[PDB]
Amino acid sequence: RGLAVGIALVMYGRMEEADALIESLCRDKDPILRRSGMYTVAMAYCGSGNNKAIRRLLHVAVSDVNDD
Amino acid sequence: DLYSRYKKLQQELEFLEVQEEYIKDEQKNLKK
Amino acid sequence: LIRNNNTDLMILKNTKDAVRNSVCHTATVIANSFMHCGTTSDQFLRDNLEWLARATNWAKFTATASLGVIHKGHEKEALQLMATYLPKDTSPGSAYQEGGGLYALGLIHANHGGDIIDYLLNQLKNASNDIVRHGG
Amino acid sequence: SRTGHTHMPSVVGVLVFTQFWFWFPLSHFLSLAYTPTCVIGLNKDLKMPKVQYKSNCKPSTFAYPAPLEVPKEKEKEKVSTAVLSITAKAKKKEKEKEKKEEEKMEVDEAEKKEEKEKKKEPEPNFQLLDNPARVMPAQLKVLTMPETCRYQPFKPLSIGGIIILKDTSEDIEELVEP
Amino acid sequence: AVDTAEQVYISSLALLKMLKHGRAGVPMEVMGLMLGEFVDDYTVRVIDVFAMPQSGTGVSVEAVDPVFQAKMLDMLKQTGRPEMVVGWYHSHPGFGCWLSGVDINTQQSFEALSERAVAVVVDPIQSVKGKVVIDAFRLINANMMVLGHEPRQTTSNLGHLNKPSIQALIHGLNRHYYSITINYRKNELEQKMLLNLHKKSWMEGLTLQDYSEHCKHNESVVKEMLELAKNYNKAVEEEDKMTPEQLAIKNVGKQDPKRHLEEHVDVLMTSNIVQCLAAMLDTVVFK
Ligand SMILES: [Zn+2]
């Protein structure tokens, strides 16, 4: 959980360059690391009304099974 | 003026499609 | 921040009286540090200590962390403030003082490169294991 | 932030503050997101001059009382005697007894109205403020520049932070350094 | 160094050995041992469960056989994996879960041997529908007896997993042990091979149940749906301003308006579509 926020915070506002990392962390079956990718897509997309972000973030907000 | 109105109508249209997609999932989810 | 010190002391006292024997002591010493942040006004660490010495084993880590929160942006005087409440001269047995003390120096001098980076560098060279390397 | 940009400490400070479930001493990190609601009228590199400028609030005043520390001293003190009986005409003839005793010997007491209403309407919304002046961020646009003083501003002043004054024509004065 | 909000990891086979050994000796409070590993300060995991032979004393320290202890461990060292015991369990059928009199005596022996030696109490006969009544507990000392027991600290995962239930707090909770949190070590390479292999039927998807049982069902449902339509006519042609939301609540009968409606029509729709789609695909595929 310390490295969860840490890899979310190593990237900040890249806005397109994290997308390979965003896809990599969420496809894994580690629940902490999927949660870590959700903080990573938050910090890479700060303050921008990204349609791809609000689609994908709401998508896992529906269908995922772990509450955290 | 007009270019800013055209960009915001592009944004708001692609916004409420996504919130339309959320209610499609939940009404499908509450059936189960 | 020191010339506009209108905080309120009695609200903190009218929440003090309802404090029962829970772990709300950490919740109060985070509450005063919020509403005295950058104020550099120590009165709860002066007027009472026996209630402050009640909770233990992480609240001491929290309380000496809250000492740095009240002294946010306190550049030179914060060094001599914890050259009074040193990581080895308060008590050599409690690692929670020296753990949260080094955490408090980071809270004060955030976004300020200087000797304090090197000062905390040399004390992570020689440190204990568990609740020293945290706040360090 | 001020100019459309966003703060890097106020973002990082609040997002680790979300992690107070897993660790309570991460809650100290919210102090990074504490940004001042003040303007600063530093004209030279050292001088902050004592300047007077005013407000444009629509009718009213606001801003930083925190006054109320009464314990609400209350009294039970009574239960109202609700005996509704021959009492009703008995108190009425007693009030007739006072119409011989009060108004015929000595009662000449009086009081004056509308003194307390008088001080309210000529009020400010022209509050003058020295250099490190606090202002609510909702009133960064309904402040007023110090045009009535000699020392009048130069930077576009519409949002809180730090500015230069144009310290105008000669006889520069008004230090403050505590 | 004192306790926090811990976490208990159980393996998938461990829970299955609990409910099977509990279902075997359902009257007479079966007993067994719990074999895992201490990974850190304050999270415990268990990988393995093996039971005990039945003693005439009951669930106590006298039910522990030391020669069945060491020789069973002698075999598991050379085959599988050697590891340290981390606790024990039993079954309490007459209630849900609380440490009784002879429960708490044998606990003191185990915490004198091990660091914690977490107890586990499972009712086998209460767990019926889709949930299991499992909970793990851990004894407290007498040094903080006038102080607040369970010395828990900076976390927020303590309010979940159970509130103290009143059938459990009437006994030794909370001034005798404490309750602990239990989640499951859910793994892949086991989850799908349990799912797809337990519920599966290959050729069932295109069977017919053909027509003589099926046209009779289509015969039946339409007949009362005709009278359901006649009852649907009766409310529609009524249509009186007798404050019709109050006229509907004084005419409640668990009946027509839309509930006893198309619900049947949906069943008539789904039955004939699956019947006819299976009929048309079977003409297509086979010659
Ligand atoms: Zn028992």
UniProtKB/Swiss-Prot annotation, chain B:
Top-rank taxon: Eukaryota
Family, as annotated: Belongs to the AAA ATPase family.
Protein name per its UniProtKB record: 26S proteasome regulatory subunit 6B
Subunit-structure text: Component of the 19S proteasome regulatory particle complex. The 26S proteasome consists of a 20S core particle (CP) and two 19S regulatory subunits (RP). The regulatory particle is made of a lid composed of 9 subunits, a base containing 6 ATPases including PSMC4 and few additional components. Interacts with NR1I3. Interacts with PAAF1. Interacts with TRIM5. Interacts with ZFAND1.
Coiled coil stretches, renumbered: none
Organism per entry: Homo sapiens (Human)
Primary role: Component of the 26S proteasome, a multiprotein complex involved in the ATP-dependent degradation of ubiquitinated proteins. This complex plays a key role in the maintenance of protein homeostasis by removing misfolded or damaged proteins, which could impair cellular functions, and by removing proteins whose functions are no longer required. Therefore, the proteasome participates in numerous cellular processes, including cell cycle progression, apoptosis, or DNA damage repair.
Location in or out of the cell: Cytoplasm; Nucleus
Gene name of this polypeptide: PSMC4
From Swiss-Prot, chain C:
Signal peptide: none
PC repeats, residue ranges: 62-95, 100-133
Function description: Component of the 26S proteasome, a multiprotein complex involved in the ATP-dependent degradation of ubiquitinated proteins. This complex plays a key role in the maintenance of protein homeostasis by removing misfolded or damaged proteins, which could impair cellular functions, and by removing proteins whose functions are no longer required. Therefore, the proteasome participates in numerous cellular processes, including cell cycle progression, apoptosis, or DNA damage repair.
Family: Belongs to the proteasome subunit S1 family.
Subunit text: Component of the 19S proteasome regulatory particle complex. The 26S proteasome consists of a 20S core particle (CP) and two 19S regulatory subunits (RP). The regulatory particle is made of a lid composed of 9 subunits, a base containing 6 ATPases and few additional components including PSMD1. Interacts with ADRM1. Interacts with ZFAND1.
Protein's name in the database: 26S proteasome non-ATPase regulatory subunit 1
Origin species: Homo sapiens (Human)
Residues of the full protein shown: 342 to 477 of 953
From Swiss-Prot, chain E:
Keyword tags: DNA damage, DNA repair, Hydrolase, Metal-binding, Metalloprotease, Phosphoprotein, Protease, Proteasome, Ubl conjugation pathway, Zinc
Span of the annotated motif JAMM motif: 90-103
GO biological process, alphabetically ordered: double-strand break repair via homologous recombination; double-strand break repair via nonhomologous end joining; proteasome-mediated ubiquitin-dependent protein catabolic process; protein deubiquitination; protein K63-linked deubiquitination; regulation of proteasomal protein catabolic process; response to ethanol; ubiquitin-dependent protein catabolic process
List of residues binding Zn(2+): 90, 92, 103
SMART domains documented for this protein: JAB_MPN
Alphabetical list of InterPro entries matching this protein: JAMM/MPN+_dom (IPR000555), JAMM_MPN+_peptidase_M67A (IPR050242), MPN (IPR037518), RPN11_C (IPR056263)
Location of Phosphothreonine modifications: 243
Tissue expression: Widely expressed. Highest levels in heart and skeletal muscle.
Cross-referenced Pfam families: JAB, RPN11_C
Entries under CDD domains matching the protein: MPN_RPN11_CSN5
GO terms for MF: endopeptidase activator activity; K63-linked deubiquitinase activity; metal ion binding; metal-dependent deubiquitinase activity; metallopeptidase activity; proteasome binding
Family: Belongs to the peptidase M67A family. PSMD14 subfamily.
Function description: Component of the 26S proteasome, a multiprotein complex involved in the ATP-dependent degradation of ubiquitinated proteins. This complex plays a key role in the maintenance of protein homeostasis by removing misfolded or damaged proteins, which could impair cellular functions, and by removing proteins whose functions are no longer required. Therefore, the proteasome participates in numerous cellular processes, including cell cycle progression, apoptosis, or DNA damage repair.
Protein name stated in the entry: 26S proteasome non-ATPase regulatory subunit 14
